[PDB]
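Hey Z.,

So I finally got round to the iron/sulfur cluster thing we talked about over coffee. Here's the setup:
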Amino acid sequence: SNLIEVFVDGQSVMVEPGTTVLQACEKVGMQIPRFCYHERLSVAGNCRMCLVEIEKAPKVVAACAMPVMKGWNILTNSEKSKKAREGVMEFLLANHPLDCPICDQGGECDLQDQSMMFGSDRSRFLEGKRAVEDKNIGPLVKTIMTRCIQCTRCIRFASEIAGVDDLGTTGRGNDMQVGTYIEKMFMSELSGNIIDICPVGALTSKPYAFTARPWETRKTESIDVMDAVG
Amino acid sequence: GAGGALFVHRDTPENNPDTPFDFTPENYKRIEAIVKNYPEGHKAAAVLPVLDLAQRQNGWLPISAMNKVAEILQVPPMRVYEVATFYTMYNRKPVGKYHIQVCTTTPCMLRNSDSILEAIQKKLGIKVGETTPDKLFTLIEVECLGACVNAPMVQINDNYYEDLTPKDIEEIIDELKAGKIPKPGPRSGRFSCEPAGGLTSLTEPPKGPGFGVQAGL
Amino acid sequence: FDNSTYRNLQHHEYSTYTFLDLNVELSKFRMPQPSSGRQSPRH
Amino acid sequence: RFRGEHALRRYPSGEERCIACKLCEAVCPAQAITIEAEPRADGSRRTTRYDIDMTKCIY
Amino acid sequence: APKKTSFGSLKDEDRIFTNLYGRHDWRLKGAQSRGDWYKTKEILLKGPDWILGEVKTSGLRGRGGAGFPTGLKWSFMNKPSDGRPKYLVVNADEGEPGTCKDREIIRHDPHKLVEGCLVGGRAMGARAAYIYIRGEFYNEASNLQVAIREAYEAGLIGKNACGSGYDFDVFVVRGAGAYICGEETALIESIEGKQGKPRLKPPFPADVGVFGCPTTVANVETVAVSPTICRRGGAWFASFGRERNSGTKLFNISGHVNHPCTVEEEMSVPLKELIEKHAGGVIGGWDNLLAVIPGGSSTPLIPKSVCETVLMDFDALVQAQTGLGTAAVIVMDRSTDIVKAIARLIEFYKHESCGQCTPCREGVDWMNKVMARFVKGDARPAEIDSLWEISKQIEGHTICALGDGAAWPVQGLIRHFRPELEERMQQFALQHQ
Ligand SMILES: NC(=O)C1=CN([C@@H]2O[C@H](COP(=O)(O)OP(=O)(O)OC[C@H]3O[C@@H](n4cnc5c(N)ncnc54)[C@H](O)[C@@H]3O)[C@@H](O)[C@H]2O)C=CC1
Ligand SMILES: Cc1cc2nc3c(=O)[nH]c(=O)nc-3n(C[C@H](O)[C@H](O)[C@H](O)COP(=O)(O)O)c2cc1C
Ligand code: SF4
Ligand code: SF4
Ligand code: SF4
Ligand code: SF4
Ligand code: FES
Ligand code: FES
Ligand SMILES: [Mg+2]
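And the result:
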């Protein structure tokens, strides 16, 4: 019908108009690295981890936000894509705190795993790190904002899914901080979900703190009975 | 270097949600005119001017002023806080009667803006980013103000004073604290962006309406 | 005719509300604004 | 470098060094280490259980 | 002799901004005396296609600094209406260090800007014009508002602009201290009451712009030269400069010159001729020249050896690896600490970054710290290469071009003054054991 033909590493794919590069990549089983993109949230495009090279194009594009075009050949594993990933990971890790042994995210961290799979294995950052003050948003979500990478997933979830506009960014530049700018509890019937969407240990569960590691746990898939939603 | 100003608000006896603030009726009329400049479905676009108006009435922006602006425009308060912390012209703390801003970027730095900064510091006896005990004068360093041709330059209360020497800024401060209004602009017999001597361009009289209009028009 | 004096002295007499007073004065000269069909994106 | 009987160490202040990261528990080839942890009364990340079975350990 | 090869001397009769120095009345009467608002009704009734064709045949390129062809960019908005209103947004943020031209345009002949707004809106089929003026230019904004008021009472704008039957408004919106708000998408976001954070492209402003409507963001110089181009023809504008570098240009010469100033000159004028003719020459003589930043802080600097024969247009400066930018010439003589100047520029960019995207937000701060250490000499020579790579990791990887504008100056400094950095590190090591 209206399907257009693109190429992922030379493999032809038929996609609907408006499909992004990331979704076209997903169709053939290739997952593009991401930090700010969530498939149930608005497209942000700020983390820049999803940069990929289009054949015969000099500038890499943000796969999460760029619609595909007819005849495009997406090169997911080229030198340009890998160098972009390494540079973005280096910038992400320059100011990140050395907190993994005391961070509850350790073992199920997207930052850790994508650094292992797409980043470099060492550092050349020879400066001091930034440190930001912590915020209190209630007894449910523990907050350690030095680990924040400014993906704005929590803000987008709060505005779009929960309907609460209490979260935002204050300042600018390297000093931009995610928070409420005042002492205010982010209290919602769906607030705890921002623990799951947060890719790092910036937001964690307070009742769960320090009790377990992800590789220890045994998972049982079952149903909730606290209401009739199931 | 470091900003030095926090982006977290902590309630204080002189800065809390119950601090009194309200627009005057004249300022309410001005707000109405401001809001009438945007499409009917987009009233948040008036956040930047109205907030500015509040500061022009108060001198600075307490959290009460931000809450009032958010209530007036039906915008959530966090958006107003975001705008107030993003833009550097907003004062989230009281400042002196005259806010002195010295451009220190490379074009002005090349023409010895350090002498102007040192002269201001010596005359007022205060560090950059500090407000005098009297409170009339507040001093800060700003980035390029768009007058690099006339350097070194200073901005005081949205007035531009250009081609400054230490004596010039000393006299400006003296007549500012004496209750007089100094003449804004350059202080080298120049009064614009022309060359200091000669007027190398635009000496012949300008020509009329139909000088070089094409045919068939 | 002469290129002697400077013709931009009027801005010496500008106060804190001049811009918004001019906006108020121009308020009556505009055309009716277009509408998106809502009161706000949250309506 | 000799490897002998196990011990848990402190900082010079007397505070325990262990912060219950469970890296030793994860890496132990004999599964000889058992760790349980919780926030302390002062909010610190410390263990409530640190067991080593020396008849399982391979040193 | 067709196809002129030496440029840089145009007389006053061929200058567009005849009141650049504010020696004549900036009000409506003076503007009409100098040819403003003349036969605008006929130009409006010539139709948008005629105006777009005149702008295209004129060879005018974007005076904001990117040099995009103006006719094609304006014709991107020549689509049929779909229900949404159409807008023209005039960029008057003027954040680039060294640049002062738009301030003089706004304060000394705002009627040129207003008439250009009307003509551009007619060409694009725009309902109204929004002028985003820098928040620090309070008196300039007030002058612009007074000129707009005079135009409104004269019938030149508003209901039935002139006698063309075209309705058009002009609004002035002031910023609040943000350099990033000069970027077109960040400017649109700031107009809508949000933080000045650029949005990704596509979509381009012609599809989804201010209030989600089709809009065009144009520099004030580009808008202000358009009515003159329409009146005198595109051929007259294209007669000046080299091919694909047509027209006249405003230049702001600042730094270590005897007479820093702002002038109007033909495009392809050589840099040395401009400096020694309009700026009084370099302080201490031409042999005292160390380096020149030709197009504002975002352009790479060039040493004295390149400035001997380089011309001031887009193509020649691109071949010199420096770009034309805003045509803001900053001159540094041999008494200048070049490392300190570049570090100050990097500090400016660190203070102006909006923080949205990772490469700018982290890497610009990183390079600021590295250059601060370079100024003293603490670093080791290997770090220089590291710094280069860091800049390469920022350029081309960010949402907007601020990251490029921060990466390029350090690239130029390393390209042309590496021995200075190396000897500074040597002296620091030798002084501190
Ligand atoms: N005037 C000033 O104060 C300042 C100027 N600048 C200059 O800005 C330049 C870079 O700015 P950018 O906007 O990022 O350059 P750009 O090339 O990305 O865009 C320039 C214009 O061309 C349009 N355009 C480009 N490609 C298009 C396409 N495929 N379709 C539709 N429209 C298209 C864009 O809409 C935009 O308005 C720099 O060279 C710098 O010199 C930078 C800072 C301050
Ligand atoms: C960080 C940044 C700041 C900018 N600031 C301005 C500015 O202050 N004024 C301006 O005219 N253009 C500025 N620009 C360039 C704009 O993109 C330009 O104005 C816009 O493309 C208008 O195009 P034009 O030059 O064809 O008119 C800036 C660009 C960037 C990346
Ligand atoms: S968030 Fe991830 S990378 Fe950061 S300290 Fe925690 S586990 Fe380590
Ligand atoms: S707190 Fe977590 S989800 Fe929110 S912006 Fe920071 S890293 Fe992203
Ligand atoms: S849990 Fe094991 S590895 Fe972690 S700090 Fe304690 S003793 Fe060391
Ligand atoms: S490059 Fe810098 S200014 Fe531009 S969007 Fe990214 S962080 Fe913001
Ligand atoms: S995932 Fe695309 S920019 Fe973040
Ligand atoms: S560098 Fe000082 S006004 Fe621009
Ligand atoms: Mg998390």
